[PDB]
């Protein structure tokens, strides 16, 4: 069962990830005081390109500018992640990744966020926005064929940051 | 109790009264087979907060109709409450003319089924769902109360789903 | 499901309401030592003019004269109430309301008093009388098409007030 | 425990009663096509004179005029009723009763309508209105010290009778 | 639901209102410790059937008092109903003066506890119980409605119990 | 649990008994159309005499005159019964018995009539009156030290027989 | 309902009245600590069939006493029934003088605990049990109704148990 | 798991491999319908204690055969263990030649059914059971491990049952 | 949650996608009736540790084919991950050409059914199973993560099973 | 009853009688704390099949001792059966002298715990288990009855674990 609810504390997670070509540990508490964008993707080494996943890495300086962490996640391993990172974008790989890419091989994080496709053991294209106090603020879940807009995600986070300080105004 | 909304599975069935074209009409999910459906929730009628978010879907509905997509607005307010707010001009902070149906979920049933109900208040969160011609739920968007939704993004999603329905996904 | 019983403590409630044009908090404990009359109505902005609801507001000086609080309630929002209050009575609105109008978007108060029409999420035309000690004394529930009488409500409260002090009757 | 709900079929009952000085059987189905007013009272032979019960008997021609049946009921025996009927009104009795007085020694009818004071085995001062189609339309329950008004009962039935044929109101 | 009356065990405890000497009094089983108690039930007040059975226990109560035995009458009629029937003279088919308390079990609780309740009518069967000084139930007699009970037999039993309490049983 | 209730069909029983010095089978259905008086007693060969039990045997011609069967019962065996019958009344025995004496060694009949003293496995001094249609009409249960009156039993049966034909009259 | 007798386990505890030397006495299992006990059941008192097999245990009790062994007879007959059968001469099919205590189990409790109760008749099967000084069940013997038990065998068993208590296995 | 062995009830059914006349054979209780059957249990093969108790039943089998009685021995050892012990001469603490079948209960099933299984060791107590022609259990004998059984006693019992089958109604 | 693999029982049935000869193919257990199957699990794709032990089964598959035996490799990695690692040269720590099918169990289903799933990591232990032609599980081998399996041993086992299928026991 | 044997978890605890150096001894798993332990199961004593598979582990025990490894054999036969088979010369299909302990599991407890018990026969499958110094299970091998185990394989596995304990982080 899903543990993700709007207004309630975001489901806690701890796993290995790949960041700057190295294995590192990533917890939700590590990003206390910051806004967090956690987004899921189905599979490593898919024939259709990860242009959407790349787009979040390329435009990370914009997220860093707003003091916002971006975390990528799938049910593939950290070893699978690093390999796809080591694959050039010319050969349908990820190339250099400026965001951490999380491994959810135990399916725990997908399950907790309720984005697991049970009959396949892979994650739907979900995207979650978590505030500085660790409260879940936004849920977005897409069916497999359709990716997510970076512009929209930026619009949402800035809207949330603005409404945090200002409440409801123009 | 439990949300019935799942990606890949049939979208939760709903049947309620609504306001369309200044009349009370019956609205069922079956009424929209062979068509894409965008169902979106809002919290309250007669809010001091700008309804420009809800109005935007009505104003830009010709864009949705052009793509053969039905748009449905919904809240836990009454069908009478809907009509009164529609009858209020936009100058006084009303909805004015609505080109889309506004569903009444005083039942709380649809909000519950789509899992968008704020239990302690009996109002719906700013959720928006995309349902395909086959009655299969394709997209879930739930926002916390202060942040509204973008029409452009909703259009970007629905067009992407329609394209991927006939074609396969393609990289270059 | 219902928590309302005669001779037992009346179901506790706390919600937002509209009184004198402002949003205020209403708790049951706020009316300790007074008799309370809590009455429900189905919907805001009905085509049927709300003459029964208006009558309890207009004749409230009589209730105040007896040190009796009168509270109106429905499953509509506080925003919905205020809009209907701001609507003139000639245009089928409530007009000036001299009693507080409670918002039960929770369904909690209706459920607790057992006046909720489940299939519609609206309250039946119920009326309840609660004594100074917070004990429920009277239960009245009407089907939707029929409203309530202020004269009866006053007769009931005055009968309860008299029997609290005296108890028994010559006729 | 209770079976009584607004808009649902009224709880079915069949018991012995006293009408016109004889023991007769009373079933709910016997009053199909008529509006029924069923009201409960606590006890036979109270020191309090039964003026409220007597008033419904005396003013019954008005109820008959509207094709409306009126039934009184308590948890006392049919023998107890008849004795109280045979007691003159000047000696704190019922006198001539022009309506049937039902014996609920079963507690069954009281339980079904949810007016039973469990700890005492007596019924609260409840009144119920049932339509020609056997659907419950109105619920009224009073704490013991306070009786009911015939004028209100007539106002209610006439309001229900009018709205059955017409439905909506100008005022 | 269940009868609580058992031979050798403590008799079911009861506490109710009653009519004694033209007044409403409170009656408890504890009020009779160190004394033998005869508790008997009857069906209805104001019966067309001769109450001579109930009256007989009142009339011959001096015989019971002489043996230091308390007699209690009971039915599921009200304490007000009891008084009205007591106030009715024996010439009109009343009880007249009652030298014993008449308990009101409108509660149905005592009838239930002694298992004498005719469920479908909410009346008590013609049951009669004998309880010793220690609050131990000693004798159960339950009769079907048409047949009354004998005072002489009740006296024969209570005297036998008192004799066997101090002495042992003896043959010759 | 007890199965005996006033107005309801009397608990059915079938067991061996001793009648005229022989073992015979006795059923409740055998006495259909007749009134039946079933009475229990605790024990065979008690030092206190069975004068009460004897009294029902001696005065049986009175019961036979009213077409009424009298049945005695205890949790002793048929062999124990016959032996006590074979013991002369001079030596605290039963002597000749004109009523059948039932054996309830399985405790089934006592249990069904709810007269069993569990901690001892013996029956209390119970007496039950059953009508021609097999309906239980009267319950009498005495504590061990106190016996039962034949006069009272006769009064009851005749009252029941009268009220059967007449209803309620003088 | 459930048997408690298990080999190698503490023998089911019992306490009841019995007849010994023509007197009512209380018998407990704890009374026989530091000693071997032979408890044997029989069906009925005043059985037409020869009780000689039961009698044989009483007559040859000097042999059991010589080995420091207690013998106990038991049935679901009363303690009064036992004494009466004891007072009946052996010539007239009685027990006569009994050197061993005869236990009354009108309770059905001891039979149940040893699992020798014939439910449909409320009588005990011809069971025989051997309990050691520490109170541990060592031997179970249960015969169907028509067949009795051998005193020689009982003796053979008990002294074999006594021998193996101190020696073990002489091969 | 609890015992299935009751007197007067059909004896627990069994089917296992056994060693008869130096060969492996299949043994069923149904095989002895119409005959009296004596089934006895023993703890272990290759014990330092003389199997003289077991031997005695084998040697004196012509007495049982004369009375049309089958005799079955059993333990929780294998058939391979049985044959090994049978092939061991009696001079070297073996069984020697066996006139009776020796049943193997390696799965502990038959011991469990007859309630002779010592759980903590997985071995059978020295039990002996007598079953009639109709397959009804007639006699239960369970001994603790250190004490053996008497053939004369077994024979006395068997004949007593055969006599009472023919007549009953005994006066010994 | 529960393992289904039992010796002497029908081997747990499986159906999944796999990589064979550089193509995505469907693999079922029913596909291998009338033949011996060796199913073996491995933890992870693109592991830094030498996959040579896994590779050895592919290289020496001619020996397995010679005995009419099917070899199946499996892990909780995707079918896309398998192919990518296959396309990675053995010089760069890849699989290279694989003569045997490599099954994808992102389901976790097959690992669970064979009871080789390491729950906390969602990866399979180094398990190896031998299934006969009738589809009955004959051998279970499970190794902890750091230790691999011997092809010689797998061969020794399978041909021993094939020999005993037709001969029994040559003593 | 189900299996308690899991990889990475503490190995199931056992305590039974065994035959070592021609004597009965008590064996516990706790006795080998700080050592690697190989526990293997076999079906039956006195089988017509050569116990050469069992013999091979006994003969080559000095290789296991060199690697500080204990080797334990087990079956559901008795210690009396074990000693009998050990005392049987290898020329006559016996075990002969045994350098390893042979555990008796007559109560079926250890087989059950390791999930190697064939229920319908009450015998153990040819299982082999490797336990580390901390008492953690490291390797499971279960064979069907007709197929034996390799000493070389057992030795290969043991050393691989000892090496990876010291270093880990392998690149074979
Ligand atoms: C997006 C994409 C992908 C996935 N792949 O594989 C290729 C390959 C070769 C050229 C272009 C290209 N694009 O663009
Ligand atoms: C009543 C009775 C009893 C029981 N017993 O035993 C005897 C014995 C001897 C003389 C008289 C007598 N009575 O009367």
Automatic annotation (TrEMBL), chains B, E, H, J:
Q: What function does this protein fulfil?
A: Thiol-specific peroxidase that catalyzes the reduction of hydrogen peroxide and organic hydroperoxides to water and alcohols, respectively.
Molecular functions per Gene Ontology: thioredoxin peroxidase activity
UniProt cross-references to Gene3D superfamilies, sorted A to Z = Glutaredoxin (3.40.30.10)
GO CC, sorted alphabetically, is: cytosol
| UniProt protein name | thioredoxin-dependent peroxiredoxin
In terms of domain of life, where is this protein from? Eukaryota
Source organism of this protein record: Ancylostoma ceylanicum
Which reactions fall under this protein's catalytic activity?
a hydroperoxide + [thioredoxin]-dithiol = an alcohol + [thioredoxin]-disulfide + H2O
Which residue intervals define the domain Thioredoxin in the entry? 5-163
- Which residues does the Swiss-Prot or TrEMBL record annotate as the active site? 50
Give the protein family: Belongs to the peroxiredoxin family. AhpC/Prx1 subfamily.
Q: Which UniProt keywords apply?
A: Antioxidant, Disulfide bond, Oxidoreductase, Peroxidase, Redox-active center
Q: Which Pfam families match?
A: 1-cysPrx_C, AhpC-TSA
Give the Enzyme Commission number: 1.11.1.24
Q: Name one GO biological process term.
A: removal of superoxide radicals
From TrEMBL, chains C, D:
**What GO CC terms are in its UniProt record?**
cytosol
Pfam families, per database record: 1-cysPrx_C, AhpC-TSA
Q: Where is the active site?
A: 49
List its EC numbers.
1.11.1.24
Keyword Metal-binding found: no
Q: Which residues form the Thioredoxin domain?
A: 4-162
User: What keywords sit in the KW lines?
Assistant: Antioxidant, Disulfide bond, Oxidoreductase, Peroxidase, Redox-active center
Enzyme class per UniProt: oxidoreductase
Annotated GO molecular function terms are:
thioredoxin peroxidase activity
Which reaction(s) does the protein catalyse, per the Swiss-Prot or TrEMBL entry?
a hydroperoxide + [thioredoxin]-dithiol = an alcohol + [thioredoxin]-disulfide + H2O
Q: PROSITE patterns annotated for this entry?
A: THIOREDOXIN_2
Q: Which GO terms describe its biological process?
A: cell redox homeostasis; hydrogen peroxide catabolic process; removal of superoxide radicals
Could you confirm whether the keyword Oxidoreductase appears in this record?
Answer: yes
Q: Where are the transmembrane segments?
A: none
Q: Which Gene3D superfamilies match?
A: Glutaredoxin
Function summary: Thiol-specific peroxidase that catalyzes the reduction of hydrogen peroxide and organic hydroperoxides to water and alcohols, respectively.
- PANTHER family with a match to the protein in the record: AT16346P-RELATED, THIOREDOXIN PEROXIDASE
Concerning its family, UniProt says: Belongs to the peroxiredoxin family. AhpC/Prx1 subfamily.
Protein's name according to its UniProt entry: thioredoxin-dependent peroxiredoxin
